[PDB]
């Protein structure tokens, strides 16, 4: 029914992922979204490392169609770039070619918590904010910001540059804004910001700030109030409008968290509350979403004008101590 000459000609010209790239046995990731391989070019024109994602499922799924639509348009140094898309007609699989990021904040933080340079924390924070700002300006929300989705480039031209990504799940609620936990129906820019504040806290202390063992999650809220304190009416007036506000009042008493505050938590982890670092962190981790700082306002904070200045390479020219990715 389709024209034969047309078919055989396109089939002849079609670049096939198995012909262009060496990747068998080099699987570095597996999750909800599908498998990610560390790939090298067979025809040795580049000789640089690439990430090959095979999208879970078959054909052009809703989710496949969304990743392609967006990533085909987005262009920013601090967001993961789509290099190429392979459609495999034989098995209906879609393959996405990304540039290879050797590191990410999950492994970097885990490596430090197992045991750096002046301004690696600040630089990481700045580049994260820069990329989220770019996405937010284009009305793209991340909706699952966490250390594992903050990639960091290894040796090469983009050494130490942060790449925001969405890797899926290999779920935990440690990075989830209190409004989501109280049943908020929609994702917002402010929800991404809270997650960036949680990452910033974790970069300063090496521990997740809200670590914890349907939309309502009691223990997760217990740990937030154990760190931040229980909010006053004045601090979050629209809390009354959250669907699970009545369950919150049923289950919790302000009195329980009377000794608790972010000042006290951070002090225990040897971060001084008179520091610009802390004063920025407090604006990111504000409980009422409308009272939360925006990504652009964060970028303009005097924290980033105080010594040391943030650098393009977050490693500041230093040798990288972290191991390469293990194959699976």
């Amino acid at each position: 029914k389709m024209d034969y000459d047309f078919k055989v000609k396109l089939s002849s010209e079609r670049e096939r992922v198995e012909d262009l790239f060496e990747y068998e046995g080099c699987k570095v990731g597996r999750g909800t979204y599908g498998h990610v391989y560390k790939a090298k070019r067979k025809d040795g024109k580049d000789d640089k490392d690439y990430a090959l994602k095979q999208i879970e499922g078959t054909g052009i799924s809703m989710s496949a169609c969304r990743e392609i639509a967006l990533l085909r348009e987005l262009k920013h140094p601090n967001v993961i770039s789509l290099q190429k898309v392979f459609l495999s007609h034989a098995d209906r699989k879609v393959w996405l070619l990304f540039d290879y990021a050797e590191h990410d904040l999950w492994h970097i933080i885990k490596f430090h918590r197992a045991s750096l340079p002046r301004g690696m924390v600040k630089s990481l924070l700045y580049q994260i904010l820069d990329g989220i700002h770019y996405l937010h300006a284009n009305w793209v929300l991340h909706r699952d910001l966490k250390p594992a989705n903050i990639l960091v480039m290894g040796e090469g031209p983009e050494r130490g540059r942060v790449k925001i990504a969405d890797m899926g799940f290999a779920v935990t609620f440690w990075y989830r804004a209190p409004e989501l936990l109280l049943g908020a129906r929609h994702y917002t820019k402010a929800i991404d910001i809270w997650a960036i504040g949680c990452i910033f806290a974790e970069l300063l202390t090496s521990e997740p700030i809200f670590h914890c063992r349907n939309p309502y999650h009691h223990d997760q809220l217990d740990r937030i109030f154990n760190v931040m304190g229980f909010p006053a009416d004045k601090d979050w007036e629209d809390i009354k409008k959250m669907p699970e506000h009545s369950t919150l009042m049923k289950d919790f008493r302000r009195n329980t968290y009377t000794n608790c505050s972010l000042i006290k938590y951070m002090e225990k982890h040897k971060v001084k509350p008179d520091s610009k670092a802390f004063h920025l962190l407090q604006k990111l981790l504000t409980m009422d979403p409308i009272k939360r700082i925006t990504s652009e306002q964060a970028m303009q904070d005097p924290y980033f004008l105080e010594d040391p200045l943030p650098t393009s390479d977050v490693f500041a020219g230093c040798q990288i101590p972290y191991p390469k990715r293990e194959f699976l």
Binding site: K1, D3, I60, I68, A69
Partner: protein, 266 residues
């Protein structure tokens, strides 16, 4: 809405605003079989098929517009013999609806929609029932996505038109008509040749001329190549003369019989 303000750095702009000369050169292979007049009548016909498919499936105008652009982009490069346009139309609707976030229209529902619109609304063009099943749609979707170089986000003149009329203070007076004229511009090549805002300005100008509204000062106060907008107004005016002189229902069966036909394997 995603990428709302990104036009000037978008794939639409950087890859899918074509030169007219290149377009008409690629068109010459279908002009061995069809006249120029007949090719344009074909374009109109399939703009109405897509619209009818959209309406039946209850899709918003923006989803219908994107699907119409995908179809246009495909036959801007390739011949009508390459893939049957009767298969391509509903495939474009199927893909567009996923991108613009309506949902994956179910197999049963897409095929029943295609079958039913052709039977009830286009029997003057098609004697036989819709022959394609879903395996065919799924195949065609892969070819469509490849030809478009995975460029899915499409900008249209509806949003700028809304912004322009709001600024005028003439929403109720002009928007109904100007919005209608924008629908009609998809009967032409305009979306392949001009940035969407320029098309918006041209339609709003024609709505103003038709409704005897003086908007000369407002247009003058804009910083735009007013010559480029005159070119678009001319194509809109020419289109309504083709509409008047075109009896789609007498002519299309014969025109569709003259289309070059896809060769089968040896």
């Amino acid at each position: 809405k995603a990428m709302a303000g990104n036009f000037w750095q978008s794939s639409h702009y950087l890859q899918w605003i074509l030169d007219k000369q290149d377009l008409l050169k690629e068109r010459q292979k279908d002009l061995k079989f069809l006249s120029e007049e007949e090719y344009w009548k074909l374009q109109i016909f399939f703009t109405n098929v897509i619209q009818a498919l959209g309406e039946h499936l209850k899709l918003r105008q923006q989803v219908i517009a994107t699907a119409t652009v995908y179809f246009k982009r495909f036959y801007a490069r390739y011949s009508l013999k390459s893939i049957d346009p009767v298969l391509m139309a509903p495939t474009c609707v199927f893909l567009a609806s996923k991108v613009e976030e309506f949902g994956v229209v179910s197999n049963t529902r897409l095929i029943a929609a295609a079958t039913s619109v052709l039977k009830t609304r286009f029997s003057y063009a098609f004697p036989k029932e819709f022959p394609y099943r879903m395996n065919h749609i799924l195949e065609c979707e892969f070819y469509l996505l490849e030809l478009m170089d995975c460029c899915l986000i499409v900008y249209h003149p509806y949003r700028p038109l809304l912004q322009y009329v709001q600024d005028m203070g003439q929403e109720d007076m002009l928007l109904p008509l100007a919005w209608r004229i924008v629908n009609d511009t998809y009967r032409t090549d305009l979306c392949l040749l001009y940035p969407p805002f320029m098309i918006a300005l041209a339609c709003l100008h024609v709505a103003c001329v038709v409704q005897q509204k003086d908007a000369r000062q407002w247009f003058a106060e804009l910083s735009v190549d007013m010559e480029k907008i005159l070119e678009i107004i001319r194509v809109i005016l020419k289109l309504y003369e083709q509409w008047k002189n075109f009896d789609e229902r007498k002519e299309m069966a014969t025109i569709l019989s003259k289309m070059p036909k896809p060769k089968p394997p040896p």
